[PDB]
Amino acid sequence: DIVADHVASCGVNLYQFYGPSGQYTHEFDGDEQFYVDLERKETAWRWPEFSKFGGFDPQGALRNMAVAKHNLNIMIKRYNSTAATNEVPEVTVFSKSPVTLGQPNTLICLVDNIFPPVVNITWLSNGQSVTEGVSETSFLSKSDHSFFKISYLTFLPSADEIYDCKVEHWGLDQPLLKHWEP
Amino acid sequence: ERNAGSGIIISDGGGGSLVP
Amino acid sequence: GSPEDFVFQFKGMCYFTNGTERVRLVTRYIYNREEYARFDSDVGVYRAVTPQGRPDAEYWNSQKEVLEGTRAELDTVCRHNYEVAFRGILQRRVEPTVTISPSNLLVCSVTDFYPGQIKVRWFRNDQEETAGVVSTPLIRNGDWTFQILVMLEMTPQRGDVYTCHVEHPSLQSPITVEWR
Ligand SMILES: *[C@@H]1O[C@H](CO[C@@H]2O[C@@H](C)[C@@H](O)[C@@H](O)[C@@H]2O)[C@@H](O[C@@H]2O[C@H](CO)[C@@H](O[C@@H]3O[C@H](CO)[C@@H](O)[C@H](O)[C@@H]3O)[C@H](O)[C@H]2NC(C)=O)[C@H](O)[C@H]1NC(C)=O
Ligand SMILES: *[C@@H]1O[C@H](CO)[C@@H](O[C@@H]2O[C@H](CO)[C@@H](O)[C@H](O)[C@H]2NC(C)=O)[C@H](O)[C@H]1NC(C)=O
């Protein structure tokens, strides 16, 4: 890897045939500064604090996506139509902060070594799907050109109140349920 | 006042292909 | 078994060392997970990284406008964004929370801090402990905070006081938490 004090991606441009779909983000020292919602064609912030560090003209992202679609067709041909390898992701679940019963906290489901960037991440509480209080990052880049993605579940710790992060990915043989308990 | 992004260059195209 | 996928990645990567004393742009062109072509501002031209990048490297290097634009992105992207965003982000500070819990073992959990530079020391009474201290890696939470856990193997006498001691750029002086 290149040695440097700080590293930014300006930006991470993803485009894939499945869908097809794309992603446009900027990263600084490994965190997501902003993204472009390509459906609404607007710059947005998963972490709105960082809107203070300047905006972005979404048309740049849209132009890049048009060029990427073109380039992808050409590279598929140059590589004999070799399909992406489905790597095996690794899933880790942990709390953001020390756990006190009845004190609001956040569960973090880290899905690492993702490729291709296609994944279902859902939360189960005592075996039942949770939808409220769930958010997730973009596909965050890695130097080996795989991705990680993190899902968050705000929750209230309580006794006999247990969780699973359920991950579906084509490189798994079955959905992966990673357990966590207070 | 705005962040700028690197632009993707348009690939050379027109190559043939082989079916796997 | 699974659906087929074909992925393209383009990465416009900016590297900064010593403030902006050294700035370097590397634009990476990737098929699936294979980088096949790249532009490195330290080199000034495109290079094929795999044979499949050779058509582009030759083509792109023949277009004066392409080379001029890409070369200018060291200024219009990297230096520009450092002025617009990254200097400020580098001024960002989020103080760590420090909690001790027993397990003989003591666990010092240091959570919810930014940036990632941090130092955690364990003390037994008035002596810093080095043997028997083991740490996790820095853990990235994804929400612009880190955490880390630092464990101390202990054989506690009653009256011994253990101190977890945390230095971080957000702090005028270290945080100290005590366990008796
Ligand atoms: C794109 O596809 C061509 C064709 O490959 C052929 O078709 C595929 C669907 C597979 O079934 C392959 O097994 C099949 O050969 C690839 O070109 C081929 O590359 C190989 C290896 O470089 C060539 O064989 C070599 O020939 C030399 C000289 O005789 C020997 O010394 C070597 O030991 C080796 O056997 C082969 O001739 C060549 N065929 C053609 C028609 O070009 C190409 O590599 C591929 N590209 C990518 C990126 O996958
Ligand atoms: C992400 O979730 C969707 C929704 O469950 C998955 O798509 C489903 O796939 C099954 C099997 O092919 C179909 O029977 C369903 O009808 C699909 N649902 C929808 C809404 O399309 C998708 O496969 C998941 N992705 C991964 C990688 O597992």
mmCIF file of C-alpha atoms and ligand atoms in Angstrom, chain A residues 118 120 168 170, ligand 2:
data_model
loop_
_atom_site.group_PDB
_atom_site.id
_atom_site.type_symbol
_atom_site.label_atom_id
_atom_site.label_comp_id
_atom_site.label_asym_id
_atom_site.label_seq_id
_atom_site.Cartn_x
_atom_site.Cartn_y
_atom_site.Cartn_z
ATOM 1 C CA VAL A 118 -24.695 -7.158 -3.387
ATOM 2 C CA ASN A 120 -29.070 -8.330 2.228
ATOM 3 C CA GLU A 168 -27.490 -12.985 2.735
ATOM 4 C CA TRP A 170 -24.040 -15.163 -2.946
HETATM 5 C C1 LIG D 2 -31.804 -9.418 -1.319
HETATM 6 O O1 LIG D 2 -33.240 -9.546 -0.970
HETATM 7 C C2 LIG D 2 -34.118 -9.873 -2.069
HETATM 8 C C3 LIG D 2 -35.519 -9.948 -1.496
HETATM 9 O O2 LIG D 2 -35.733 -11.139 -0.744
HETATM 10 C C4 LIG D 2 -33.706 -11.160 -2.772
HETATM 11 O O3 LIG D 2 -34.530 -11.323 -3.927
HETATM 12 C C5 LIG D 2 -35.488 -12.422 -3.822
HETATM 13 O O4 LIG D 2 -34.926 -13.634 -4.388
HETATM 14 C C6 LIG D 2 -35.773 -14.791 -4.283
HETATM 15 C C7 LIG D 2 -34.999 -15.953 -4.868
HETATM 16 O O5 LIG D 2 -34.460 -15.646 -6.150
HETATM 17 C C8 LIG D 2 -37.100 -14.546 -5.003
HETATM 18 O O6 LIG D 2 -37.952 -15.674 -4.828
HETATM 19 C C9 LIG D 2 -37.772 -13.297 -4.452
HETATM 20 O O7 LIG D 2 -38.946 -13.014 -5.208
HETATM 21 C C10 LIG D 2 -36.825 -12.097 -4.519
HETATM 22 N N1 LIG D 2 -37.462 -10.923 -3.942
HETATM 23 C C11 LIG D 2 -37.473 -9.730 -4.542
HETATM 24 C C12 LIG D 2 -38.195 -8.635 -3.813
HETATM 25 O O8 LIG D 2 -36.910 -9.540 -5.623
HETATM 26 C C13 LIG D 2 -32.231 -11.106 -3.169
HETATM 27 O O9 LIG D 2 -31.849 -12.367 -3.713
HETATM 28 C C14 LIG D 2 -31.335 -10.761 -1.955
HETATM 29 N N2 LIG D 2 -29.939 -10.742 -2.333
HETATM 30 C C15 LIG D 2 -29.087 -11.701 -1.968
HETATM 31 C C16 LIG D 2 -27.670 -11.526 -2.425
HETATM 32 O O10 LIG D 2 -29.430 -12.657 -1.300
#
